[PDB]
Amino acid sequence: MFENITAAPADPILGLADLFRADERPGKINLGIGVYKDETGKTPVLTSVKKAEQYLLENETTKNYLGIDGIPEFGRCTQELLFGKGSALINDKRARTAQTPGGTGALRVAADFLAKNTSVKRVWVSNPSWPNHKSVFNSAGLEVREYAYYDAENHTLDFDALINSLNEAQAGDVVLFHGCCHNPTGIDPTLEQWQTLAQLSVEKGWLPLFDFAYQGFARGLEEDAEGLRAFAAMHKELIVASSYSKNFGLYNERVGACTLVAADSETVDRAFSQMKAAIRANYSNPPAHGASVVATILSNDALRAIWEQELTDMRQRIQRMRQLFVNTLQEKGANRDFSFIIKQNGMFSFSGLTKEQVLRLREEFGVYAVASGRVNVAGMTPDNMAPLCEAIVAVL
Amino acid sequence: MFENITAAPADPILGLADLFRADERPGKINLGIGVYKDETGKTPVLTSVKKAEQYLLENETTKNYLGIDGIPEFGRCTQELLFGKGSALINDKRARTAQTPGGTGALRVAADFLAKNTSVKRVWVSNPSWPNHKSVFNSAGLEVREYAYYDAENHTLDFDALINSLNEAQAGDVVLFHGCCHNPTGIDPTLEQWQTLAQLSVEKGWLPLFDFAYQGFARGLEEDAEGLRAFAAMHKELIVASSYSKNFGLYNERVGACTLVAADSETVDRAFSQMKAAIRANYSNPPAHGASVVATILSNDALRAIWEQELTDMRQRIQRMRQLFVNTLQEKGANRDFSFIIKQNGMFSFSGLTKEQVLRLREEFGVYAVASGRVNVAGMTPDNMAPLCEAIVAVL
Ligand SMILES: Cc1ncc(COP(=O)(O)O)c(CNc2csc(C(=O)O)c2)c1O
Ligand SMILES: Cc1ncc(COP(=O)(O)O)c(CNc2csc(C(=O)O)c2)c1O
């Protein structure tokens, strides 16, 4: 049965990772990492999370299965984060949330739900996007089409090209939007651009699918949800796949949410019954530990305040690195405009380097980024900035 | 998009659960539960698990993502449990294990892997089985066909009927076997019957899929793997979906494994690359907490000994309840042979009651089982046995 199976395309993440590992050189630098790192180059467990985990160890009396949609408090806190306390969406009971194994799990549950229960055949994704989007939707039998996004000349959102591309989208197609901190570009629509897109989506009959993996990493929790909320104000229906992997530092505990919104409570409950069926046939019910940590923190004033500050600290360190990168490149004699880096949001940006410059950086200088030239600004520290920038200047 | 969606068939588990909840009566009894309960009617966190969780709280320094296939130690310990220390399968590097979100996750990963990478179109499942098997395989686009299993007259394995049914299975079909503690019947093949099935499967070209959710609950860890090991001795290829939900009491942490076996290391590695692709497009990588608890326990002599005894205690309490049930039914004047209950393995048995007797038990006596008459023997206690049995006698 297995003798003729073709190997999966080689894992570029493992990577990357393996080549970085094997590199004998000082002072090698990894900007290809997917996770947040602090100023010491570590990805520690958040203090709020450790406190929550201690509480759970002390207080949990069973590991009995959660419901298919997971911890109710988790769902409520999630909806509040997404839509705002006192949202009409929430008051009108138009939203249902399933706790899922990560944002990826939320995307797959959405995909399976759509493939099995609706006429959706096609999902529109930005060019570029997170490479796993295509894999996830294709796995559910959905076609993926790309829309223009990145102005490679100006390092900005090519809004005209985006709108032009999306004209080929038919009524009943899904359009995927990154809520904030677009991956890989860090380029997000302005609020006005979100409002234009929201209006257009209603007119064209698109089903919006928001992917929210970085809430809090651009400007702040509420500010980062403005785009979603602009859509939510205009649409009867949408889906949000969110993740707590980066903003709680809970990567390996697999904590995310799939939130379904419909015109009213009867309709969302009916649709959600099929989303739960989709979950039941996949992993049955979701993993408690990470989601319980999130619910414990979000629902406690003390823990929530500690967590919010920890998230603020991450957001701010990333901003400081964006600034330090631009200043240091100028001071190492780059003699080119990198100001776009200051304006971009979240851990990721395109450096504007070509695939060959990126390969050169890896081979000659032991500086590691992904082929598109995307770099994780959180892999940067005050200590590694000067060598990093000297290497980049050298390949310009 | 959502206005015309048909509701999923009503959840019979929630159930059941809700009706039991709402019942005003003493002394209501729930034999429809899916989990183990102790003599006090609780499903506590195992002491070995609490000790492991304390260790992890103390020692974990990151929540950085696991690899797609999860914790390496977990995979190694899993393979040892399944195949035995010093298994040729292990020595020859013929097996690869992905840590998954529960046994259900392992079954879905197997299903997706098979649907996408092989000519498999059909999975053979016992009549009866766990109702979610059909849902999981159908979700991946695989047809499910049933084979005869339960001799409703004799409360035994209808081996002749089983073999006859499975003659309709074509070469290249998957045949699902419950490793031990068949759900719902508690009726398992004898070792000789397993050996006959292993020979037949080779001859007919079936791909065996073992579902192992109850290792340790029949006779013991090694004894319960005899069937699997008989197949493993005969086959180049097989898949095992295992779960640690019941034997570690880790239900809600979603801890299982999908183990792929092929003729040699080159072939299994190549095939496993596509199993990892299947995982990546589903939930990306698996939840650490539960699997880390399992790996911590299994790989430490002290914790493993505590856990093994806890599992033994569960196994033995279930056996004592099977015995007490049969004795108490006789002493309440049932006047019918229930000896089959003593011989059956694990938490579940068919009582031999009809769907209407089961409904009567619920409505008139507040005793709750599933419609097929399956009962969870672990819902039985010395304290509730007499009323339970008086109710059953009353509906005979
Ligand atoms: C756009 C987008 N969508 C979904 C996800 C899924 O988050 P989790 O599955 O980790 O919760 C993520 C985060 N997962 C991720 C891990 S490394 C990475 C990267 O681009 O380097 C991304 C994301 O960036
Ligand atoms: C035959 C079989 N296959 C797979 C599973 C999956 O185990 P987890 O997904 O819970 O790890 C299980 C256990 N899941 C389960 C929860 S309640 C239940 C029942 O029949 O009542 C079964 C099983 O009995």
Query: Following DSSP, what letter does each residue of B190-240 receive, concatenated?
Result: -HHHHHHHHHHHHHHT-EEEEEES-TTSSS-HHHHTHHHHHHHHH-S-EEE
B130, B194, B206, B307: the active-site residue: B130
Amino acid at residue number B365? F
Give the position, in ligand 1's atom list, of the atom nearest the Cα of A102.
11
Using CA atoms, how far apart are residues B26 and B48, in angstroms rounded to an integer? 35
CB-based contacts of A28: which residues, under 8 Å, 6+ apart? A20, A366, A367, A368
Torsion A203-A207-A212-A216 (CA) sign: positive
Chain B touched by A53 (CB under 8 Å) = yes
Residues ≥6 apart with Cβ < 8 Å to B248: B46, B48, B49, B255, B290, B293, B294, B297, B307
Torsion of CA B84, B200, B110, B297, to 10 degrees: -20
**Domains (range + CATH), chain B:** 11-44+315-396 (3.90.1150.10), 45-314 (3.40.640.10)
Tokens for A19, please give them: 């080549």
Chain A to chain B Cβ contacts (< 8 Å): 230
Q: Which residue owns the Cα nearest ligand 1 atom 6?
A: A103
Return the C-alpha torsion angle B372, B378, B381, B387, nearest 10: -10
Token duo for residue A269: 């409950």
Q: What are phi and psi of A301, to 5 degrees?
A: -55, -45
Chain A CB within 8 Å of residue B65 CB: yes
Identify which of B111, B115, B75 has the alpha carbon closest to the alpha carbon of residue B96. Answer: B75
The C-alpha atoms of residue A216 and residue A145 are separated, in whole angstroms, by 28
The closest residue, in CA terms, to atom 16 on ligand 2 is B34
Give the distance (Å) from ligand 1 centre to CA of residue A140. Answer: 18
In the stretch 159-198 of chain B, residues with CB closer than 8 A to chain A read: 172
B186 exposure class (CB count in 10 Å sphere: 0-12, 13-18, 19+)? buried
From B89, B77, B65, B3, select the one nearest B280 (Cα to Cα). Answer: B65
C-alpha dihedral (B219, B223, B229, B230), degrees to nearest 10: -90
Residue A212: helix, strand or coil by DSSP? strand
Instruction: Tokens for B11, please give them.
Output: 């959840």
Technique used by the depositors? X-ray
C-beta separation of A86 from A220 below 8 A? no
Decide if B63 touches A, using CB distance below 8 A.
yes
The answer to whether the bond into B346 is cis (omega within 30° of 0) is no
Q: Which residues of A are catalytic?
A: 130, 211, 246
Q: Which of A65, A252, A286 comes nearest B64 by C-beta?
A: A252
Chain B residues inside the 8 Å CB shell of A277: 8, 135
